[PDB]
Amino acid sequence: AVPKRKMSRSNTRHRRSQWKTVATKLVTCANPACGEKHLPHTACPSCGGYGPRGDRRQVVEA
Amino acid sequence: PKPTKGPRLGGSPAHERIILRNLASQLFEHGRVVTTVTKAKRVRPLAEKLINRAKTDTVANRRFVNRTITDRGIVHILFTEIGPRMEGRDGGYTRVTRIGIRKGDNAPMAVIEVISDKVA
Amino acid sequence: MKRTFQPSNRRRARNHGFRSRMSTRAGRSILAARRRKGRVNLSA
Amino acid sequence: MSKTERPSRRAALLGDRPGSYAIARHVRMSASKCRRVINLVRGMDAVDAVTMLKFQPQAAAEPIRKVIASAMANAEQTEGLRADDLYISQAFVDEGITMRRIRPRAKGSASRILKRSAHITVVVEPKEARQA
Amino acid sequence: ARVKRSVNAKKKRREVLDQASGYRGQRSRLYRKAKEQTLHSATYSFRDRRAKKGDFRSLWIQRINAASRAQGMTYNRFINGLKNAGVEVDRKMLAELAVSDINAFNSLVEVAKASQPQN
RNA sequence: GUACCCCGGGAGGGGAGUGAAAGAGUUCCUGAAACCGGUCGCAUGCAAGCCGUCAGAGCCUGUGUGGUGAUGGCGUGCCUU
RNA sequence: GUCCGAACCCACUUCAGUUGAAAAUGGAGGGGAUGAGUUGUGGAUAGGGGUGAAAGGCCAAUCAAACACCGUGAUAGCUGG
RNA sequence: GACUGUGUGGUGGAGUUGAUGCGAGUGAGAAUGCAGGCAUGAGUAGCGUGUGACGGGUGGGAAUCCCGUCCGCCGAUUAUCCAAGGGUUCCAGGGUCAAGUUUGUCUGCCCUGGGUGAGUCGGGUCCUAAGGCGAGGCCGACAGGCGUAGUCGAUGGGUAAC
Ligand SMILES: [Mg+2]
Ligand SMILES: [Mg+2]
Ligand SMILES: [Mg+2]
Ligand SMILES: [Mg+2]
Ligand SMILES: [Mg+2]
Ligand SMILES: [Mg+2]
Ligand SMILES: [Mg+2]
Ligand SMILES: [Mg+2]
Ligand SMILES: [Mg+2]
Ligand SMILES: [Mg+2]
Ligand SMILES: [Mg+2]
Ligand SMILES: [Mg+2]
Ligand SMILES: [Mg+2]
Ligand SMILES: [Mg+2]
Ligand SMILES: [Mg+2]
Ligand SMILES: [Mg+2]
Ligand SMILES: [Mg+2]
Ligand SMILES: [Mg+2]
Ligand SMILES: [Mg+2]
Ligand SMILES: [Mg+2]
Ligand SMILES: [Mg+2]
Ligand SMILES: [Mg+2]
Ligand SMILES: [Mg+2]
Numbered sequence: 187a188v189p190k191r192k193m194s195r196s197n198t199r200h201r202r203s204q205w206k207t208v209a210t211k212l213v214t215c216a217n218p219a220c221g222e223k224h225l226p227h228t229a230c231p232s233c234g235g236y237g238p239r240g241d242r243r244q245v246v247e248a
Numbered sequence: 249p250k251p252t253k254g255p256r257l258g259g260s261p262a263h264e265r266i267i268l269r270n271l272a273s274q275l276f277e278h279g280r281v282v283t284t285v286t287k288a289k290r291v292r293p294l295a296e297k298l299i300n301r302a303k304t305d306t307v308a309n310r311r312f313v314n315r316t317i318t319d320r321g322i323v324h325i326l327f328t329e330i331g332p333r334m335e336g337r338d339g340g341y342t343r344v345t346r347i348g349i350r351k352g353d354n355a356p357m358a359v360i361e362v363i364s365d366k367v368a
Numbered sequence: 369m370k371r372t373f374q375p376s377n378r379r380r381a382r383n384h385g386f387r388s389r390m391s392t393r394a395g396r397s398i399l400a401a402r403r404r405k406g407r408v409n410l411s412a
Numbered sequence: 413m414s415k416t417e418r419p420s421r422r423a424a425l426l427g428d429r430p431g432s433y434a435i436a437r438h439v440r441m442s443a444s445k446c447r448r449v450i451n452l453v454r455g456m457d458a459v460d461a462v463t464m465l466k467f468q469p470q471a472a473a474e475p476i477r478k479v480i481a482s483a484m485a486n487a488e489q490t491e492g493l494r495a496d497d498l499y500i501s502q503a504f505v506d507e508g509i510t511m512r513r514i515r516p517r518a519k520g521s522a523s524r525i526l527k528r529s530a531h532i533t534v535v536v537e538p539k540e541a542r543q544a
Numbered sequence: 545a546r547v548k549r550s551v552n553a554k555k556k557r558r559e560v561l562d563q564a565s566g567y568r569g570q571r572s573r574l575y576r577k578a579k580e581q582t583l584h585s586a587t588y589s590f591r592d593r594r595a596k597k598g599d600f601r602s603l604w605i606q607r608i609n610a611a612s613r614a615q616g617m618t619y620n621r622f623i624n625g626l627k628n629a630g631v632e633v634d635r636k637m638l639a640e641l642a643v644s645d646i647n648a649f650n651s652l653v654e655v656a657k658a659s660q661p662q663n
Numbered sequence: 664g665u666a667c668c669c670c671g672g673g674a675g676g677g678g679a680g681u682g683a684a685a686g687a688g689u690u691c692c693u694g695a696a697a698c699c700g701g702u703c704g705c706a707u708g709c710a711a712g713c714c715g716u717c718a719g720a721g722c723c724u725g726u727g728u729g730g731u732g733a734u735g736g737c738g739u740g741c742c743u744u
Numbered sequence: 745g746u747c748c749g750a751a752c753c754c755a756c757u758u759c760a761g762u763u764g765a766a767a768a769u770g771g772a773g774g775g776g777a778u779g780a781g782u783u784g785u786g787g788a789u790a791g792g793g794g795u796g797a798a799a800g801g802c803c804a805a806u807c808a809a810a811c812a813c814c815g816u817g818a819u820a821g822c823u824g825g
Numbered sequence: 826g827a828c829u830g831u832g833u834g835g836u837g838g839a840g841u842u843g844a845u846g847c848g849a850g851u852g853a854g855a856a857u858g859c860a861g862g863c864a865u866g867a868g869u870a871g872c873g874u875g876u877g878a879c880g881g882g883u884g885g886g887a888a889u890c891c892c893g894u895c896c897g898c899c900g901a902u903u904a905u906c907c908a909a910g911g912g913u914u915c916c917a918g919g920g921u922c923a924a925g926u927u928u929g930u931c932u933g934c935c936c937u938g939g940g941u942g943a944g945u946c947g948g949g950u951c952c953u954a955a956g957g958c959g960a961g962g963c964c965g966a967c968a969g970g971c972g973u974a975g976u977c978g979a980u981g982g983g984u985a986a987c
């Protein structure tokens with residue numbers, strides 16, 4: 187079908203305001219020598235590492 | 249192993265069969281592979297079954313592994329290097345780690361690697 | 369599908385060329401009118 | 413007329429308050445898609461904003477990030493402020509030049525394609541100005 | 545003598561858009577919609593200026609009724625009694641008394657009571 | 664017709680310079696409306712609305728005038744035909 | 745102007761497409777397929793005219809009289825402004 | 826009342842005010858009006874048959890560029906070479922505004938420079954078909970029609986290399 191009338195500014199904005207995203211949350215690297223933000227359950231971009239402070243492992247050589 | 253329930257990789261079940269075989273072969277050839285999250289999590293069981301078969305070295309076992317893989321250099325690596333590495337490991341020969349996303353299509357990437365350290 | 373324009377340079381020159389227009393008084397007047405308008409192309 | 417203080421961007425965005433700003437004009441991205449990220453970034457601390465935009469999946473996160481960085485750099489050069497004690501005080505997106513293009517449709521029809529642009533403005537201030 | 549229309553034409557548009565400076569949506573932004581709405585507003589305001597007399601008289605009558613029924617008198621009897629007593633205070637001032645000076649209103653109620661036919 | 668410096672791969676911007684003026688910076692005189700937004704004030708999640716009009720509290724402002732406006736009554740667009 | 749059947753020519757049915765991949769097609773089948781066959785190159789017939797194994801069919805993607813320009817700003821007791 | 830102040834700012838940067846006459850391309854809300862710009866639908870439908878995966882490189886930036894290895898696909902054609910048609914798209918380097926239905930460091934795109942060599946191949950210089958034109962001429966109020974002698978005209982004949 188085809189829109190019967192021009193949608194009003196109120197209704198258009200009511201619907202359009204719900205097209206939105208959320209901010210990425212980010213977590214601090216557990217590595218003391220990096221301390222950079224990364225995604226949770228994701229290897230750190232800055233050091234390529236993963237794991238808790240005690241038992242770290244390297245996932246990316248970057 | 250278990251089927252994949254939903255729509256298959258590559259637009260056809262035959263192509264997913266081929267993709268998983270190739271991905272497991274590449275993981276065995278290189279030791280680690282960056283292969284998007286779903287492909288890594290989907291090839292983990294098949295690769296682990298192949299490594300478990302490769303743990304015991306016989307000609308029948310090598311032929312059965314060569315049904316999959318189909319590359320004899322990969323079979324040699326699997327029965328000579330990877331297989332002996334997991335003598336005391338009862339399962340869990342691989343691990344998957346999320347790596348980020350791809351810029352082009354937002355695909356969540358991951359690294360699947362074969363466990364590199366001896367259990368003992 | 370097959371479309372209306374099938375190019376042939378020989379047929380084009382025989383149909384709309386300068387000498388074809390010069391061959392008749394209607395074509396000569398067409399060339400005169402295109403000179404009057406100022407076309408940079410008088411014919412094909 | 414013959415009056416002082418001709419209008420300027422600084423006087424309208426800051427007005428003798430400490431801080432700085434940046435504008436990225438003619439960014440070849442739609443204003444709405446840039447606003448989807450600008451709404452996230454507005455009011456945040458600037459360093460947190462740039463680190464978060466490093467991870468934001470949207471394509472507009474790379475332009476906006478640069479603008480923020482530029483604003484921070486400006487504040488580090490005309491005001492002496494440091495990057496870690498700045499917050500994104502204001503942020504908005506305006507429309508730029510929209511190019512017209514034609515996409516051929518079925519049955520000899522051509523539909524109109526609008527290639528929109530955006531101007532992204534970011535104004536940063538010290539964190540002490542958040543409550544003042 | 546070719547004339548351009550804009551300089552003369554924008555005057556009425558500015559006037560109408562100033563008169564429509566609280567309306568919702570297209571009625572406060574577009575000259576044609578604002579013009580239709582100002583036609584309706586003019587009709588409404590002319591009609592309500594005339595209906596204001598009746599509305600305020602109704603309110604006064606209600607308040608007078610309420611204040612005189614507290615003294616045991618209906619509005620019709622109160623009005624007839626004030627007419628018979630000769631006190632020509634109109635309903636506007638009667639309502640103003642009924643709100644602000646209730647003792648004066650009650651004394652007027654007594655005046656109206658004493659001036660009833662009682663038949 | 665913007666030397667030079669800063670952020671940036673650039674585009675763009677920020678300082679600075681030229682100029683009487685740069686918000687006259689080459690998309691360049693003036694720069695309206697539609698349309699798109701940032702900020703502030705008020706209202707708005709029990710409500711039936713040609714979206715106004717009259718009555719009217721409250722809040723903000725008070726540049727003692729202005730903004731908004733809960734709530735009550737009345738109220739079925741414009742043109743052509 | 746045999747038969748079955750590819751290329752090739754066509755277009756019977758059906759499904760899809762219907763702002764299409766396409767201003768007539770695609771998938772699956774279907775008809776002819778040594779003949780009145782099909783096709784490349786050049787050529788001839790021109791508008792009250794052409795050509796037509798004949799449907800008013802075709803004559804450069806709307807033909808019971810093409811298209812372009814001119815008479816021309818045709819005329820309309822009609823609709824609209 | 827159409828409107829308006831010789832009030833008061835802002836912007837602007839070269840014209841224009843009042844009185845009285847004179848002349849109008851003198852007033853727009855609508856013609857499925859014309860031109861431009863911008864909304865609504867809507868961040869919605871679509872992104873044009875399909876099989877890609879990984880390793881490394883380049884780079885500010887890589888699913889989409891380069892290299893390699895696996896795997897898959899066409900193969901009376903998804904191969905190779907011509908005609909017609911197009912016209913520089915070819916090659917090398919530099920580029921990433923625009924174009925490419927996404928990205929792009931890439932390109933049939935942009936800019937600069939370069940590149941095509943014949944006694945024998947395909948045409949002309951040879952020959953004619955259909956058809957065209959046509960000295961004289963015949964026909965026709967004019968305009969023009971036809972046509973002889975001729976002259977063109979390949980899709981054919983002739984002609985020396987692998
Ligand atoms: Mg709704
Ligand atoms: Mg199943
Ligand atoms: Mg898919
Ligand atoms: Mg199969
Ligand atoms: Mg077409
Ligand atoms: Mg009355
Ligand atoms: Mg200078
Ligand atoms: Mg100005
Ligand atoms: Mg201007
Ligand atoms: Mg409520
Ligand atoms: Mg009701
Ligand atoms: Mg037969
Ligand atoms: Mg038969
Ligand atoms: Mg037929
Ligand atoms: Mg011909
Ligand atoms: Mg018939
Ligand atoms: Mg036709
Ligand atoms: Mg007809
Ligand atoms: Mg006729
Ligand atoms: Mg006439
Ligand atoms: Mg005068
Ligand atoms: Mg006029
Ligand atoms: Mg108008």
Ligand SMILES: [Mg+2]
Nearest residue numbers: 854855856858
């Ligand atoms: Mg109109």
Ligand SMILES: [Mg+2]
Nearest residue numbers: 864865866867
């Ligand atoms: Mg829109």
Ligand SMILES: [Mg+2]
Nearest residue numbers: 205206868869
């Ligand atoms: Mg969505």
Ligand SMILES: [Mg+2]
Nearest residue numbers: 866867869870
């Ligand atoms: Mg929808």
Ligand SMILES: [Mg+2]
Nearest residue numbers: 867868869870
């Ligand atoms: Mg949907």
Ligand SMILES: [Mg+2]
Nearest residue numbers: 869870871872
């Ligand atoms: Mg979709």
Ligand SMILES: [Mg+2]
Nearest residue numbers: 891892893894
């Ligand atoms: Mg490759």
Ligand SMILES: [Mg+2]
Nearest residue numbers: 897898899900
């Ligand atoms: Mg095959």
Ligand SMILES: [Mg+2]
Nearest residue numbers: 911912913941
């Ligand atoms: Mg050539």
Ligand SMILES: [Mg+2]
Nearest residue numbers: 913914936937
């Ligand atoms: Mg070139």
Ligand SMILES: [Mg+2]
Nearest residue numbers: 913914933934
């Ligand atoms: Mg070119």
Ligand SMILES: [Mg+2]
Nearest residue numbers: 914915916933
């Ligand atoms: Mg090339």
Ligand SMILES: [Mg+2]
Nearest residue numbers: 917918919932
């Ligand atoms: Mg190149």
Ligand SMILES: [Mg+2]
Nearest residue numbers: 925927928929
């Ligand atoms: Mg692109």
Ligand SMILES: [Mg+2]
Nearest residue numbers: 920930931932
């Ligand atoms: Mg390139």
Ligand SMILES: [Mg+2]
Nearest residue numbers: 954955956978
């Ligand atoms: Mg001959």
